[PDB]
């Protein structure tokens, strides 16, 4: 028992992290097979950063302008190309620690683990969700660009996120590993703002099931709601609408606990209208929305 | 910016995890050099578990009764011994992935990362604190015994925790890596209960400094308190007393923010007496006590 914010073990990704330097600019890269992937903004300086023309910037580089270090070993760059907002540096040596991998783009509402790195060296691991507005509420400092986000299934690492920047509100923005931004963001230092966010309703319900599995029952009640009457209240409180597909996804947890999804929705309705009255659920005094149904099943059965 | 529950990268510990089986009983072990460390309760069955005499149980075992698997490789056991509540199995092969390591016992109030494992295979990583009452609020299922807790400094893994059991309240109990329990607990399936816990005051103050560093200022006020008048309120709310040593430890954060420790204590006094009024700090609607001053400095400067 117990329920924690839990990340995937990071070892397979640690063996892929390298440092990439172009000039005075250093960040992290991901070394898979004989390619290193990194944010293309490594080719900017503070002079360019405001509105770079990346095509011109890259034409003016050569292979020898890129210094890649894997530990103390320098890897020689033998080719370079741009892939949307990612740079691909071909190196003369394939990474012997390359895991089985794929590049997957995730949806808003889904979670992943982040390995935060500085200077090519892994510093910490945490879990987060892709928000409805395509930002992440991460923890990243200067130097952390090129840190990646991932999930692991069996032996295979599905990379989903590469870190590019911090927005003025302190949340984070980045790309998939094909270099395409999540959200309406661009890789320049400008006036960008995260749009309005919403709470991920299916994940709040999943976490209420986790709470019941762990013995927190106080918010349960004898009522039920329709899906439509629930979604009416959802809209008022800035929650995403709950679909029948979401109801279906919560099936396993509803069966484990014996509490119908629309019965749990009546609890959530009550919590939104009334608050918690000073009580807690799974150690929290607010409704948590960054655990998916899959995340809950992972900790609350195995 | 941003502040997350962050664990250490787990790779160095992943390369040490093995499966240990004695009979029908399987759990995890830690393979360092030519020794595997695991909970001695691997030598029990459900028949013994209520009140085992471990000395008699171990005398009746031979090397061949222990099956150790490192992936698909079976490691041959060539010796066995008991070390308090840990079993040490000498194997014929030294682990080539052994990191630099030490075995350290931690204090209540300190944090560490847990690599939760099942069948010798790493499943997830999370961060937690040693509570004042010597339990941990972990996330562990059947099969997770022998999972370890650790911190990393530079290249060196300091192992501090091996998991042994779950108490009736759903919190967790275990040993240091010399086999000595944290807390007044024993490795038998009996009527054990966690004692009364307290909130770790120095860590709450550290997290309030983290909040200020990240732009949450609403709880700040123009007041100050004495240490003695603060500790008076601390006692009422079940918080540990704040020492001058704690004040000294918070020095760096107080200097970074410009807010004296006893000025921050007046904020904490106000939050304890009044609540948050519906507001949040770092994404939480309660006061968080599982980040140390060191943890805060790590994310809020590097
Ligand atoms: O690493 C951080 C960073 C700072 C603070 C908090 N963070 C949390 N996650 C990451 C950070 N950068 C460096 C890169 N930046 C850029 C973003 C878009 C386009 C170009 C650049 C750029 C390129 C060359 C030099 C410079 N430059 O000199 O500023 C900036 C963003 C800020
Ligand atoms: O793995 C879990 C576990 C279950 C549920 C939640 N958990 C969260 N962390 C770990 C768990 N065990 C197995 C070991 N147990 C024991 C604890 C003390 C002394 C002996 C035994 C013992 C030994 C041989 C067989 C059996 N047996 O058959 O029960 C039990 C505790 C329960």
Q: Are residues B234 and B279 in the same domain?
A: yes
- The Cα-based distances of A223 to A148, A219, A226, A235 in angstroms read 44, 11, 11, 20
Closest C-alpha among B22, B66, B69 to residue B48: B22
A145 catalytic per annotation: yes
What is the distance in angstroms between the CA of the first residue and the CA of the last residue of chain A?
Answer: 10
Least distant ligand from the CA of B21:
2
Phi, psi for B228 (deg, rounded to 5)? -65, -40
Q: Are residues A243 and A129 in the same domain?
A: no
- Partner A, chain B 212-231, Cβ-Cβ below 8 Å: 214-215
Answer yes or no: is the C-beta of A189 below 6 A from any ligand 1 atom: yes
Closest C-alpha among B9, B281, B290, B245 to residue B128: B290
Could you say which DSSP state residue B233 is in? H
Q: Are residues B273 and B202 in the same domain?
A: yes
Using a CB-CB distance cutoff of 8 angstroms, which residues of chain A are in contact with residue B138?
2, 4
Instruction: Tell me how many domains chain A contains.
Output: 3
Q: Are residues B192 and B242 in the same domain?
A: no
Pull the structure tokens for residue B93. 């092969």
CATH number at residue A105: 2.40.10.10
Q: Tell me which of B181, B197, B213 is where a domain ends.
A: B197
Rounded to whole angstroms, the Cα distance separating A204 from A230 reads 14
Q: Are residues A46 and A133 in the same domain?
A: no
Closest C-alpha among B32, B36, B11 to residue B102: B32
Burial of A227 (0-12, 13-18, 19+ CB in 10 A): middle
Q: Are residues A2 and A149 in the same domain?
A: yes
Residue A246 contacts residue A252 (beta carbons within 8 Å): no
Domain range enclosing B40: 15-99
CB atoms within 10 A of CB B75: 22
Catalytic residue among A145, A160, A265, A300: A145
- The Cα-based distances of A54 to A48, A85, A146 in angstroms read 9, 9, 17
Closest C-alpha among A2, A207, A291 to residue B138: A2
Experimentally, the structure was elucidated by X-ray
Answer yes or no: is the C-beta of A147 below 6 A from any ligand 1 atom: no
Q: Tell me which of B140, B167, B197 is where a domain ends.
A: B197
Where is A271: in which H helix or E strand?
helix A261-274
Interchain proximity B9–A7, CB inside 8 Å: no
Catalytic residue among B22, B41, B44, B160: B41
Residue A107 contacts residue A286 (beta carbons within 8 Å): no
Phi, psi for A134 (deg, rounded to 5)? 70, 20
Q: Which region, left, alpha or beta, applies to residue A170 given φ > 0 means left and ψ of -120 to 50 means alpha?
A: left
Task: Give the bridge partners for A75, in sequence order.
Answer: A68
Pull the structure tokens for residue A130. 């892709």
Which residue, chain included where needed, has tokens 């982040």? A114
Which residue from A2, A7, A214 is facing B138, i.e. has the nearest CB?
A2
Residue B126 contacts residue A6 (beta carbons within 8 Å): yes
Please give the resolution of this entry in Å, rounded to 1 decimal: 1.4
CB atoms within 10 A of CB A244: 9
Task: Give the bridge partners for A19, in sequence order.
Answer: A28, A69
Residue A48 CA, ligand 1 centroid: distance in Å: 12
- The Cα-based distances of A104 to A128, A298, B282 in angstroms read 16, 20, 30
Q: Are residues A108 and A51 in the same domain?
A: no
Q: Which residue's CA lies nearest to atom 12 of ligand 2?
A: B142
Q: Tell me which of A38, A73, A99 is where a domain ends.
A: A99
Where is A75: in which H helix or E strand?
strand A73-75
Looking from the CA of A280 toward its CB, the CA atoms found within 13 Å total 10
A41 catalytic per annotation: yes
Which residue, chain included where needed, has tokens 């990340």? A7
CATH number at residue B293: 1.10.1840.10
Instruction: DSSP for B122-156, please give it.
Output: EEEEEEEE--TTS-B-----TT-TT-EEEEEETTE
Could you say which DSSP state residue B76 is in? P
- The Cα-based distances of A283 to A265, A276, B90, B138, B172 in angstroms read 21, 12, 41, 12, 15
Where is B31: in which H helix or E strand?
strand B25-32
Residue B41 CA, chain-centre distance (Å), reads: 20
Identify the closest residue of chain A to B118 by CA–CA distance. A302
Q: Are residues B185 and B203 in the same domain?
A: no
Helix axis angle, B261-274 to B201-213, nearest 10° = 100
Q: Are residues A85 and A151 in the same domain?
A: no
- The Cα-based distances of B37 to A245, B58, B297 in angstroms read 46, 15, 33
Residue B28 CA, chain-centre distance (Å), reads: 17
Burial of A81 (0-12, 13-18, 19+ CB in 10 A): exposed
Sign of the alpha-carbon torsion through B289, B152, B171, A115: positive
Answer yes or no: is the C-beta of B141 below 6 A from any ligand 2 atom: yes
Question: What is the largest distance, in Å, between two alpha-carbon atoms of chain B?
Answer: 69
Rounded to whole angstroms, the Cα distance separating B269 from B224 reads 10
Residue A143 contacts residue A26 (beta carbons within 8 Å): yes
Which residue from B172, B299, B301 is facing A139, i.e. has the nearest CB?
B299
Q: Are residues A157 and A219 in the same domain?
A: no
Could you say which DSSP state residue A38 is in? E
Pull the structure tokens for residue B87. 């079993």
What is the distance in angstroms between the CA of the first residue and the CA of the last residue of chain B?
Answer: 10
Burial of B40 (0-12, 13-18, 19+ CB in 10 A): buried
Which residue, chain included where needed, has tokens 């309660």? B286
Residue B143 contacts residue B39 (beta carbons within 8 Å): no
Give me the helices (H) in chain B, please: 11-14, 54-59, 201-213, 227-236, 244-249, 251-257, 261-274, 293-300
Q: Are residues B118 and B130 in the same domain?
A: yes
Q: Are residues A87 and A126 in the same domain?
A: no
Phi, psi for B296 (deg, rounded to 5)? -70, -45
Using DSSP, state whether A13 is helix, strand or coil: helix
Rounded to whole angstroms, the Cα distance separating B239 from B285 reads 18
Residue B133 contacts residue B195 (beta carbons within 8 Å): yes
Give me the helices (H) in B136-260, please: 201-213, 227-236, 244-249, 251-257
């Amino acid at each position: 028992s117990g329920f924690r914010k839990m990340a995937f073990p990071s070892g397979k990704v640690e063996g892929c992290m390298v440092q990439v330097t172009c000039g005075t600019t250093t960040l992290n890269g991901l070394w898979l097979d004989d390619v290193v992937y990194c944010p293309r903004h490594v080719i900017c300086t503070s002079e360019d950063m405001l509105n770079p023309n990346y095509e011109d910037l890259l034409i003016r580089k050569s292979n020898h302008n890129f210094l890649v270090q894997a530990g103390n070993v320098q890897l020689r760059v033998i080719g370079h190309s741009m892939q949307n907002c990612v740079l691909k540096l071909k190196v003369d040596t394939a990474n012997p620690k390359t895991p089985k991998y794929k590049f997957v783009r995730i949806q808003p509402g889904q979670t992943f683990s982040v390995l935060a790195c500085y200077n090519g060296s892994p510093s910490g691991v945490y879990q987060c969700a892709m928000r409805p507005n395509f930002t992440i509420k991460g923890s990243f400092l200067n130097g952390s660009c090129g840190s990646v986000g991932f999930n692991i299934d069996y032996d295979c690492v599905s990379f989903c996120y590469m870190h590019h920047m911090e927005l003025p509100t302190g949340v984070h923005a980045g790309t998939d590993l094909e270099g395409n931004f999540y959200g309406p963001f661009v890789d320049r230092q400008t006036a960008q703002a995260a749009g309005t966010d919403t709470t991920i309703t299916v994940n709040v319900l999943a976490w209420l099931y986790a709470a019941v599995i762990n013995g927190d029952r106080w918010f349960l009640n004898r009522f039920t709601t329709t899906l439509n009457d629930f979604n009416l209240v959802a809209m008022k409180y800035n929650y995403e609408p709950l679909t029948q597909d979401h109801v279906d996804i919560l099936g396993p947890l509803s069966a484990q606990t014996g509490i119908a999804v629309l019965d749990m929705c009546a609890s959530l309705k009550e919590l939104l209208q009334n608050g918690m009255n000073g009580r807690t659920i799974l150690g929290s005094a607010l409704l948590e929305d960054e655990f998916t149904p899959f995340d809950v099943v992972r900790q609350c059965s195995g």
